[PDB]
Design a protein around this ligand. Structure first.
Ligand SMILES: Cc1nc2ccc(-c3cc(N)nc(N)c3)nc2n1CCOc1ccccc1
Ligand SMILES: [Cl-]
Ligand SMILES: [Cl-]
Length: 330
């Protein structure tokens, strides 16, 4: 697609903004609205078109709901078919939270900026949980959270290409590996709670600069999670189709790890407080004496993250109750 093309006496293509398995995203001048827009151009392959039609349906469903929470998700302006490609037109946004970490040389941002991100992210999750929506994103990661403006800390969620409503699930293998919830690793039916799991993983990474759980495979992934949060509850592993991919049951109805060729820190011993550096002056001690990073501030953040990383998705912290947490009290 050329960097001067004109479409439908309406759009002038400027540049490639983004690429994907879905196709590509281009910067285009909308001659009617007289503004720049982002156009998501889907490949003319049955598979991407079908999944993108679902994304359009979910996006248009959200547009029909006027609240104070709807403006944390990229607004879909419109869509059309051109040259046999489904085209989604969005408001222009800026760079993503991963690029923001890259720009800190992976040293992380302040707890204060982390809090501002958490609050927006939790308000978006609350909006998707409105019963008549009930949309699971299924691919929350730093790369799918964009700054509205390179000067500001306003963010919006993008990419509803993996998203499904509750009880419209298609795939068992969903979510980006590092952000994949245990329920989805364990091959169990997933909720809106898998996004809260992902959000917890992201918020830590935003502050430390490194992914909380960077598995090289599903097995590696679950082992890195168990290092921090210990063995999942028996009641969960008993109902889990793929419990025996990672764990083994014992005479007395208790569970342990399947082992292979040696090494990980033993279950629950890689403590989040050390990962966060609560009482050691933040991540790698780099925040020693910096304001808004009091041990009290860090402990509230630690408490909220462990509510987002509950193994049980039925007791894992839902969004309204994450906005009530002391970590957000000024
Ligand atoms: C700069 C900019 N404005 C945007 C507005 C919307 C979207 C946008 C992108 C996608 N995949 N899905 C939706 N629903 C909206 N992406 C924008 N980008 C950067 C584009 O890069 C990407 C590419 C792939 C994934 C994420 C960001
Ligand atoms: Cl990443
Ligand atoms: Cl996915």
């Amino acid at each position: 697609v050329k960097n001067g093309e004109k479409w439908m006496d309406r759009y002038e293509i400027d540049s490639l903004i983004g690429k994907g398995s879905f196709g590509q995203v281009v910067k285009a001048y909308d001659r009617v609205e007289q503004e720049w827009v982002a156009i998501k151009i889907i490949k003319n392959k049955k598979a991407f078109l079908n999944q993108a039609q679902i994304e359009v349906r979910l996006l248009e469903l959200m547009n029909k709901h006027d609240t104070e929470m709807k403006y944390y998700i990229v607004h879909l302006k419109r869509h059309f078919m051109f040259r046999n490609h489904l085209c989604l037109v969005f408001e222009m946004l800026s760079y993503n939270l991963y690029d923001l970490l890259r720009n800190t040389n992976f040293r992380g941002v302040s707890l204060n900026l982390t809090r501002k991100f958490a609050q927006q992210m939790c308000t978006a999750l609350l909006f998707l949980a409105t019963p008549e929506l009930s949309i699971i994103h299924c691919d929350l990661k730093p790369e799918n959270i964009l700054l509205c403006n390179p000067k500001r800390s306003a963010i919006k969620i993008v990419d509803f290409g993996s998203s499904c409503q509750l009880g419209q699930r298609i795939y068992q293998y969903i979510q980006s590996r590092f952000y994949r919830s245990p329920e989805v690793l364990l091959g169990m039916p997933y909720d809106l709670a898998i996004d809260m799991w992902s959000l917890g993983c992201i918020l830590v990474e935003m502050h430390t600069g490194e992914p909380l759980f960077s598995g090289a495979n599903e097995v590696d992934q679950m082992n890195k999670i168990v290092e921090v949060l210990g063995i999942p509850p028996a009641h969960i592993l008993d109902q889990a189709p793929k419990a025996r991919k990672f764990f083994e049951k014992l005479p007395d109805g208790t569970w342990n790890l399947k082992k292979t060729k040696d090494e990980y820190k033993p279950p629950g011993t890689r403590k989040l407080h050390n990962i966060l550096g609560v009482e050691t002056g933040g991540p790698g001690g780099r925040r020693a004496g910096e304001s808004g990073h009091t041990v009290a501030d860090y402990l509230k953040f630690k408490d909220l993250i462990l509510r987002m990383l509950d193994y049980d998705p039925k007791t894992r912290i839902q969004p309204y109750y994450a906005l009530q947490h002391s970590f957000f009290k000024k």
